[PDB]
């Protein structure tokens, strides 16, 4: 479970990535971690 504002997307790339676009976050690390 993430904090609010994080879009957890699963791309055909085969990788999970966390999208918080205020600033435009695309990160490998769970922001809850």
């Amino acid at each position: 479970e993430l904090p609010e504002g994080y879009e957890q997307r699963t791309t055909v790339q085969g990788q999970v990535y966390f999208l918080h676009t205020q600033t435009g976050v695309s990160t490998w690390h769970d922001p809850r971690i």
Partner: peptide, 8 residues
């Protein structure tokens, strides 16, 4: 309409 992917 398009988000960016992570570079690994």
């Amino acid at each position: 309409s398009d988000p960016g992917s992570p570079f690994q």
